[PDB]
Each structure stands twice: as C-alpha cells, then as structure tokens.
Design a protein around this ligand. Structure first.
Ligand SMILES: [Zn+2]
Ligand SMILES: [Zn+2]
Ligand SMILES: [Zn+2]
Lengths: 56, 43, 49, 56, 138, 147, 164, 119
DNA sequence: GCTTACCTGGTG
RNA sequence: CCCCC
DNA sequence: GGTAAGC
C-alpha cells in the first residue's frame, strides 16, 4: 500500500535519526561504557539494534 | 584529452568517486514514491 | 625524498593525463605516512573513471 | 567504498540496505548485500569435509 | 624478469611483550642463523650506533622507538667494524661470501650491482621502522 | 555462590577478587631505575615522606622504583603492605623492600639489592612483573559477575 | 622499649612541626603516650603486627595532603579510635575519600560481564511458553539453489528453533 | 629516557658509578669517554600507556579529498572551513572523538564535551 | 619440550 | 573434470 | 595444509 510505504519510509528515517543522535553523542565523548565494554563496541550495539528494530 | 583515467585498487584509496554525474554532482539551488532511496552529493 | 610532494604529485598526474606517462602507471600520495608510491608494475587490475 | 568520505559510520556506509527487493538496490547496497551474501556460501564450502568426516 | 629471484627477507622482532630485551634480528638468504640488525648495518658500512639509530628512527623526540632499539645496540656490541661484521657470516673465505650475499642476494630489487650500500642500509632502516611502528600500538 | 549469599552483589565482587589471578604487573603503572645513592635522603622529592617513615624507628645505590594504580589495587581488595610483603617473600634476604603507605597520593615501592649491580636490577624487575602472584588462582585469567 | 621512646619522639616532633607548635607541651606529651598506651593494646609487643599499626598513624599525619590531620589531632580527636580504626581510608583526607568512592563504583561496574540485548518480534510465537518475544537471525546453510535458514530464539523462556 | 651518544666515536653511552664522590656518570664502551649524568633516572619501563592523540597533520593535510568537511567555526580564526577525523592511534579502546583541522589557520580542535580539550 | 605420521563429505 | 544437498 | 602422540 501507498500510505504504508510512507509509514515504512518515515520508520527507516526515524531509526536513522536515532543512529545520528547516538553518533553525535559518541563523537562528543558522552557515550557511556556498557558492561559489554569498549565505547566503540558499545556504540555499534546501539546502532545495530536501532537498524534491526527498523527492519522489523 | 585527459577526460577519463585508469585507476588500480592502490590509487582508488586516495580518490572520492561520484555514482552518477547528476545524483552526486550539481549543488542544491514532491519525490517519486516508486523509486528506490539513494544517498547524496555529500562533499 | 621530496620537499614539496603536493606540487610533484600534480606535475605527475597532469603529465600522465596528457599521455607522457603511460595511463597504466599508478601514483598515490599518503599524506599521513609521508609517502609517494609509483607503480610501473605489471599485473595490476585497473578500471576507467 | 571510495564513493564515501573517510570515518563514515552512517547506516548507508556500513551496509544498511533501506530499500525492498521490489524497490531495487543502490550500487553500494548491491555490493554490501553481495559481501554478506558470499558469507554463507564460503562456510558451506569450507565445512563440508569436516562435517563429513565427523559423520563417518 | 631477472631469473625468478624470489628472495624473502624477514626482519623479526624476537621476544614477546612480557619477555625482557626485545631484540630485532633478520634472516638473510643462504645464511642459516638470524643476524642481529646492528651487525648487518655494520657490514653495510654504517659503523657507530647513533648513525645506525638515525637510519631507523627519523625523530629524536621518539623515546619509545629508541628504547626498543637499545637491546639491539647491546646485541651487536661484539662486532665493532665492517670486516668484523662480514666475517660474522657462515675467515678470508667467510669475508668474500658475505660481501657477495649482501650485494647480490640481500634486498635484490633496487640494485644488486655494488656501489650502493647506503641505498640498502636506509631501506633496512625503513623496514625496522615499519616493524617497530607495529610493535608499538601505533 | 554460597546459598544465602547468591543475592548479594558485593559478596560476589569479593569472591571475584579471591579467584581472578592478580600479578604484580596487573597493578603496576610503571617501574623505574634511579641512581639514588643516599638511603637516608632520597634524590626524588616526592619520596621524602616514604623515607621519614621506614627509617624513624652497605645496601645498594641503585634504586628500583615502581608506581602502582589505586584503581587496580582497589578492584582486587589489595594494600601496599600485602604487596610489599609478597615482594619481600619472593626475594627473601636478597632485596631491600620499603613502600609508601595506603593513603599517600602516589602509590610507590622502593627496592635495593644486597662487581657490577645495575643490570641485575633489570633482571629482578622482569621476574617481579612477569611472575609475582598477589591474589587469585593461576590459569583463571579473567572473572566476570553475572545475574 | 624501642617503640615506647620512638613512637613518642616521632609523635612529639611531627605534632610540634605543625604551624600550631607545642603550646600544649604537657598535653601533646600526654596525647602521644595515651595514643601509645592504647597502641600497645594491639599486641603489647607480642606480635610484629602491632608495628604495622604505627606506620598507619605516622603516615597519615606527615603526608601533606593532608596537613590538617596534624592540627586537629592536637585540638582533640579520639585517641582509642586511632588504634582500632582500620579506618585507614576514612581517616585522612576527603578528596581521596571522594576518589575512592568513584573508584569502587567504577570497578564494580567494570567487574560485570557483557549483556547483549537482542531485538525481538511479535511475529513469531514460542512453542513451549507460547510467547511472542522472539529474536531471530538468518544464515545460508543450504546451496545457493535453496533459501536461507532463520534461527529463532525466545527472549522470554529461552528456546531455540529453525526454518526452510 | 633521553639517551646520549659518545663524543669522538658516535657509539651509545652506558651508566657507571663514581663511588668516590657518589655521583652518576655515562661512559663509552668503544673508547675511554666519560661524561656526567643529568638525571638520576637511568631506565623507565611504562606498562600503563595513557594516550589518544590527533594525527600526522601535514600543514597541507587538507589536500586529501577523501576527508570529510564540517561547517563548524574555528575557535581561533572563526573560519567555518574544517576537515575532520577520529584518533589516528586507532586502538579498539578509543573514544569516538573528532579532531577538526581548520584549513585557514591550521589549528587543531576537538569535538570533546567531557572537558576543555584542544590537543 | 621439538619432529613425525596420520588424516581430510557424496555421486557421476 | 563438472555436479550435488 | 591441521592436530597429536612419538622420541
Ligand atoms: Zn518461549
Ligand atoms: Zn667513544
Ligand atoms: Zn582557523
């Protein structure tokens, strides 16, 4: 459906925003550790998850 | 006439490539829903 | 070694683009490692752009 | 890819295919999908002997 | 196309992170044992430490790299001149065999003629630099 | 965890400290060698307070000085005394061990031996780092808490 | 009697070396032996473990930081406590006390192992617990002729399954 | 530890004690040279290495066309002309902090919000 | 603690 | 070889 | 070209 495609497009763009936000947070040394270590590992978890929640 | 060049994988590491002349070249100076979503003229 | 690698790199690229250096010869400038790599070498896979 | 800038962690740069097979893949998406595609085929090719000898 | 000269020179960093006195040694073709880098430089004409150091670490402020080179300096202390270094290969007979190896078989690309020892020396220093650059988390 | 202690996070942290293999190297920030010839008066102005203690109540002019990380030391429930004594027992009557007390800003251990002298201190610092067990069980290289 | 004279001497001096100096000469002497009398309450020179207690008292006094432990020790501040303290950390100073808290907190965070969330879908339903809190992943297990595999996990009960 | 070289022969200098006057000296093993020491520090071994610096910034590092550019204003010149990148010592254990090099005044600035970080 | 001697899917 | 789940 | 049970 047409309106469903609009919904699906704004969904992907909405998750993409969260990613950018978690990026700007990580880039400004504000992103917090995670027991599942590395600031870099930690950032990638948040990103990966956001994009998976998006596909689903 | 220096319009087109030959690039190996080593030289590729130092260049920035456009996908389409349009899609990535003129600066910005409604949209088709059926069409697939592309990136930008970023730099 | 080269003192002004930026100029040399341009003088080389335009020299090749003209035809004077075989179009297959590869030239790379790694600003970080302060190196200029030139390959005349046979067996390099290359594409036109 | 050389099509992107350096230090790019955006969905697009790190392999997020945002379109459906119905919409079509962009060249980058096409290549990244191929990168991750190959993944399985490699494993199945490698495993085959080890999986066989265990059976025996 | 100079007759399949597949000469594979290795410059090894002996000793692990935890083990004291991390020595740098190299494998020369037709030369059984691994020669400590200093002795090679000495056999290439570059005799004092500090001149040998200058071929490896281009920056004097780099105390890190220089400290790693300190056990090498000590490793090749015994050999103190070129003919002494060339002899540390395999006397008289030993000295020519060495000259030939370092000339024709060591770093065969560039040139394998004769009148370039500095060219090879500087290159060996470049390899050590790239090696120590990786030894360091750099 | 032991029955009535399975819900206590703090209990598990202490057990972790008791299990995970803790070397001297694991707590050390850096180790230095100085030519400090007077035992009664240190060349290092920082160590002034260390001297005024382990003195108020023939050796070696060569000083092995190692600084320890408070955080490291605190994670494994350790103190300067416990660490010093472990070095004191691994070398017996061969090395002279003095140390900074637990509340001084910088955590330091000062060592002196009992022809040459200098190079055998680089020897002593290698075995010191690489193989001195402070706390923990060997082979258990990392321990984590889980719920 | 080595310590009986040395604990005093060191206490007297490092308690007169202060900006306060010894105006309370009869009380700085009394404060020192009274701390030394309860000090021997540790062992009474029966164990060398008593000597280790001294180093705690002496060190926190000299130090610099903290200089104020000196001035406040002649002013008053419990002498029997400063033997059975164990409060080696809670006594002297306050910026280190705050730092020890931050250290303890962080080290307890560090000690905790990796979690890994897993993105869940209502689409699939569990077999056993019959719950729609399913976390899948696909893999090319078969030839390029047939499709992927899809390995589902129930993030609720914890159950695993497969597909064609 | 800033090690010195012998005069005459360029060879490396080694520590030695002047027991007579309780002072440190550095002597040459290739000859009879001897000089006074500066510091009492003879050797430093660092186990914990706290660093995460910028890069090999050529005063023409900007010539790299693969580098991303920001419109952030320069803290020194106020030129909204910058080129940015992550830490070059690229450890796994590295912050995702950015280092902007203004093309106009060639001054380095960081995207840090934790502290007052310039280096 | 190094060198040897065994092995490595199914049909056609 | 050239084909297979 | 990967592991182990020989000397
Ligand atoms: Zn379930
Ligand atoms: Zn000399
Ligand atoms: Zn500027």
């Amino acid at each position: 459906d047409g309106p469903t495609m609009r919904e699906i497009t704004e969904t992907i763009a909405e998750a993409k925003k969260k990613v950018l936000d978690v990026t700007k947070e990580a880039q400004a040394n504000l992103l917090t550790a995670k027991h599942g270590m590395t600031l870099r590992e930690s950032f990638e978890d948040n990103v990966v998850r956001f994009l998976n929640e998006a596909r689903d | 006439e220096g319009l087109v060049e030959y690039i190996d994988a080593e030289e590729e590491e130092s260049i920035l490539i456009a996908m389409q002349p349009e899609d990535l070249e003129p600066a910005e100076a409604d949209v088709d829903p059926a069409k697939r979503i592309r990136v930008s003229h970023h730099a | 070694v080269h003192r002004n690698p930026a100029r040399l790199m341009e003088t080389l690229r335009t020299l090749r683009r003209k035809g004077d250096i075989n179009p297959e010869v590869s030239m790379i400038r790694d600003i970080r490692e302060k190196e200029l790599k030139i390959f005349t070498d046979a067996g390099r896979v290359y594409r036109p752009l | 890819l050389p099509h992107f800038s350096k230090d790019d962690y955006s969905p697009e740069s790190k392999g997020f295919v945002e379109n459906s097979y119905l919409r079509g893949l962009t060249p980058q998406e096409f290549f990244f999908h191929a990168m991750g595609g190959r993944e399985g085929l490699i494993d199945t090719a490698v495993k085959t002997a080890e999986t066989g000898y265990i059976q025996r | 196309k100079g007759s399949r000269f597949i000469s594979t020179l290795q410059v090894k960093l002996y000793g692990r992170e935890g083990s004291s006195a991390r020595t740098i040694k190299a494998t020369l073709p037709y030369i059984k044992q691994d020669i400590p880098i200093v002795i090679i430089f000495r056999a290439l004409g570059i005799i004092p430490d500090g001149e040998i150091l200058e071929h490896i670490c281009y920056d004097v402020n780099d105390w890190q790299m220089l400290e790693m080179l300190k056990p090498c300096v000590e490793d090749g202390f015994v050999i103190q001149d070129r003919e002494t270094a060339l002899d540390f290969i395999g006397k008289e007979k030993r000295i020519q065999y060495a000259k030939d190896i370092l000339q024709k078989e060591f770093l065969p690309h560039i040139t394998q003629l004769e009148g370039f020892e500095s060219r090879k020396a500087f290159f060996l220093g470049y390899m050590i630099n790239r090696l120590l650059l990786c030894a360091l988390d750099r | 965890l032991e029955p009535g202690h399975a819900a206590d996070q703090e209990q598990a942290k202490l057990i972790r400290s008791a299990i995970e293999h803790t070397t001297l190297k694991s707590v050390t920030i850096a180790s230095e060698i100085y030519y400090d010839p007077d035992p009664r008066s240190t060349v290092i102005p920082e160590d002034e307070e260390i001297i005024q203690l382990h003195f108020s109540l023939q050796q070696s002019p060569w000083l092995l000085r190692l600084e320890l990380d408070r955080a490291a030391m605190n994670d494994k429930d350790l103190t300067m005394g416990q660490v010093g004594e472990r070095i004191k027992q691994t070398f017996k009557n061969d090395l002279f061990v003095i140390w900074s007390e637990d509340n001084d800003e910088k955590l330091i251990i000062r060592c002196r031996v009992v022809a040459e002298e200098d190079h055998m201190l680089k020897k002593i610092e290698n075995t010191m780092l690489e193989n001195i067990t402070l706390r923990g069980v060997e082979n258990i290289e990392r321990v984590v808490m889980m719920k | 009697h080595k310590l009986r004279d040395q604990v005093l001497k060191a206490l007297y001096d490092v308690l007169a070396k202060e900006s306060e100096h010894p105006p309370q000469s009869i009380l700085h002497t009394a404060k020192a032996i009274e701390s030394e009398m309860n000090k021997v309450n540790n062992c009474d020179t029966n164990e060398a473990a008593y000597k280790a207690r001294y180093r705690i008292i002496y060190s926190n006094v000299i130090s610099k930081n903290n200089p104020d432990l000196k001035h406040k020790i002649a002013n008053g501040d419990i002498t029997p406590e400063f033997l059975a303290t164990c409060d080696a950390k809670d006594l002297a100073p306050a910026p280190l006390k705050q730092k020890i808290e931050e250290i303890a907190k962080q080290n307890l965070y560090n000690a905790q192992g990796a979690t890994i969330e897993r993105s869940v879908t209502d689409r699939f339903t569990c077999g056993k617990c019959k719950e729609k809190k399913v976390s899948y992943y696909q893999l090319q297990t078969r030839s390029a002729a047939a499709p992927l595999t899809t390995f589902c996990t129930c993030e609720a009960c914890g159950n695993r399954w497969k597909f064609s | 530890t800033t090690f010195r070289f012998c005069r005459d022969c360029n060879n490396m200098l080694y520590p030695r004690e002047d027991k007579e006057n309780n002072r440190l000296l550095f002597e040459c093993r290739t000859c009879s040279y001897v000089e006074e020491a500066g510091s009492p520090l003879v050797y430093r071994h660092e186990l914990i290495t706290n660093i995460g610096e910028t890069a090999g910034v050529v005063q023409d590092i900007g010539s790299d066309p693969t580098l991303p550019r920001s419109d952030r204003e320069c803290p020194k010149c106020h030129s909204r002309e910058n080129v940015f990148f992550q830490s070059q010592q690229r450890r796994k254990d590295t912050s995702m902090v950015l280092f902007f090099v203004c093309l106009s005044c060639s001054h380095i600035f960081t995207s840090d919000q934790k502290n007052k970080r310039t280096q």
